[PDB]
């Protein structure tokens, strides 16, 4: 019934060219590399190479072929997605991109000298929604590190594995009010939130306490690959050798936490700190990070594969934490102006989240003095002012 | 001559569809992702949206567009490549693949427990030639570590940076006749050859001695990416956390070499050993490794980019070393039967090289007791018996 509906949308011809069939199929934003339509793409190849004719659509083959992806095609082609007129949305995104390109900023990275090798004019924005509508511009294919942008993800790991009460037995859930590098605890001698460095160290201590570092990294990498829909998730070893021989404030924070005895029993501080460095050393592209902040923009389900990834409790908790203290000292101003859950990092990534609507990633090596990208902040302000 | 080339390609008809142009390119074995034809690919892209005819190539657009790759296109379309009749060559490869799939083998990996998680039935073969002709089958897209296969590459890098006399001031050029884990030196208290573990450690000690590991890894990764034509050269951190907590023979070998004072002056043993582990922990796919062993099959020129990577002296030296002692104690039998320069690996990769013709890669997790893949050895024997 969907093929005759599309024929009614068509100009009255039974046969339509495939190279024109892909048009108005990408106009709704659904890409041709979706694993949901992997059966559709392989059957389309099997029809395309073994015809030598072209301009062939057919109706009975289209009826008998797809039985589970019919609902996705009907939702996409009837403008039943969350965001219609996606060409206009991409036009707005491109206009905001060109407006934010005028800013200059500066001061990319003093410490972590491997991070200072990026040119200051790099700029890219990726967009991915709940249904699977995705679009990206700029330098979205260039890999970049996930410094401090993995902290909400690893907090979700800890919560979904061990229960929120056991997770918050060792950490608080309040904003610190100071820089993330500054070391101090609350009245109960605990880190203020998982987003600061001390809370990140403590929540790395929780994940899979009974196994070695290799199995821990394998588990978190496999699960994050499941969350990303098997996208590109690398590991920048060049930025891991740096920040290990040059990152001294994190070592001081870890030794302070060890001295304050706020660790789980039978835990080695040095190995946990090295594991935290390894988690900070993960690198993804902007397109790959568009799938990030979109599984948690949904109800814990992957926007592309639809698999069960995170429990809704973990997603709600990490969304609340990102809304509260996800932008260091700029969190209050960000909630005042933008009012959306977002996480930043010294690499230049912004994990902007719109709940139940869409996800977004912005990448810009220049940084503000508080540790946030100026171009991404201006882009977010323009986006919340326009839409 | 380009009109005459089109007259040779066509059968006499002026109208040639894009479907006819996109076929017989895979017959020539030149893939669409070649940066040499990147301007031709850009022409194809711009004429896919703007041709005003639909499924048409036209003579005049091809005349006015190709302005730097006339020689490559003319050599490709007149069967001037080193390997003609690529369909027969791929059929031979498929027959050898089916013959080698019958064997079982066993004994995947005992130590490095992260390496033991691979499936024993995984099997893939990738092929690339000097001109750029390539073909792959099986599991060619699954990444795997480059354990013991990066040693000729790092040896070539060290030779290119330093000079043969300065490289061999510390390392001999003779086979050992024992396993790579055996802890002994020659009469002059030196490692026997760069292929074994001690020689690999010493030649890692020589690359950029005055610079820390953070920029050394970036340097060697830049050279590897230039050799690979910007293909997928990843880093498996899971297999780097393992083999560091469990690799004990390498630590004993390094401490023995430090005691024998064969290291360069002012060199830390632990940091160089960690850098060696990092260099062994680099992971690639079968296709990306097939891009390798073709630059050194050529005179140091990358088959894909066409640039210059390695000096001919380094290429000749590493080819001679791989021919002499590139298969551990099985090197004599390999030269007796196959007689081609190949490098083995505990991961399962085989870096089979045919000089000035074509490069290869065979990937099989099961291993013989000597330290080589059984399926790869059988495949090499069948290949040298057939062609
Ligand atoms: N923003 C962070 O704290 C993580 C990255 C930072 N450079 C660090 O490791 O201290
Ligand atoms: N074949 C090998 O020896 C490589 C395994 C490990 N990298 C080692 O040096 O021992």
Curated annotation (Swiss-Prot), chains A, B:
Highest taxon of source: Eukaryota
Gene Ontology BP, a term: glutamine catabolic process
Key words, A-Z: Acetylation, ANK repeat, Cataract, Cytoplasm, Disease variant, Epilepsy, Hydrolase, Mitochondrion, Phosphoprotein, Repeat, Transit peptide
Activity-regulation annotation: Isoform 1 and isoform 3 are activated by phosphate. Inhibited by BPTES. BPTES binds between subunits and favors dissociation of the tetramer into dimers. Inhibited by 6-diazo-5-oxo-L-norleucine (DON). Enzyme activity is stimulated by phosphorylation.
Outcome reported for the amino acid change (mutating residue 184 to S): No effect on catalytic activity. Loss of inhibition by BPTES
Tissue-level expression: Isoform 1 and isoform 3 are detected in brain cortex. Isoform 3 is highly expressed in astrocytoma, ganglioglioma and ependymoma. Isoform 1 is highly expressed in brain and kidney, but not detected in liver. Isoform 3 is highly expressed in heart and pancreas, detected at lower levels in placenta, lung, pancreas and kidney, but is not detected in liver. Isoform 2 is expressed in cardiac and skeletal muscle.
Modified residues (N6-acetyllysine): 173
Reaction(s) catalysed (UniProt annotation): L-glutamine + H2O = L-glutamate + NH4(+)
One term of GO molecular function: glutaminase activity
Effect of residue 151 to A: Loss of enzyme activity
Modification after translation: Synthesized as a 74-kDa cytosolic precursor which is proteolytically processed by the mitochondrial-processing peptidase (MPP) via a 72-kDa intermediate to yield the mature mitochondrial 68- and 65-kDa subunits.
Region Highly mobile activation loop: start-end pairs: 177-184
Coiled coil: none
GO CC annotations on file: cytosol; mitochondrial matrix; mitochondrion; synapse
In-chain residues carrying the UniProt-annotated modification N6-succinyllysine: 26
EC number: 3.5.1.2
Binding annotation for substrate: 148, 197, 243, 250, 276, 328, 346
Subunit structure of this chain's protein: Homotetramer, dimer of dimers. The tetramers can assemble into rod-like oligomers (in vitro), but the physiological significance of this is not clear. Interacts with RAF1 and MAP2K2. Interacts with ATCAY; the interaction is direct and may control GLS localization, negatively regulating its activity.
Note on domains (UniProt): The C-terminal ANK repeats prevent the assembly of the supra-tetrameric filaments.
Function: Catalyzes the first reaction in the primary pathway for the renal catabolism of glutamine. Plays a role in maintaining acid-base homeostasis. Regulates the levels of the neurotransmitter glutamate, the main excitatory neurotransmitter in the brain.
Family (UniProt): Belongs to the glutaminase family.
Involvement in disease: Developmental and epileptic encephalopathy 71: A form of epileptic encephalopathy, a heterogeneous group of severe early-onset epilepsies characterized by refractory seizures, neurodevelopmental impairment, and poor prognosis. Development is normal prior to seizure onset, after which cognitive and motor delays become apparent. DEE71 is an autosomal recessive form with onset at birth. Death occurs in first weeks of life.
Protein name in the entry: Glutaminase kidney isoform, mitochondrial
Species this protein is from: Homo sapiens (Human)
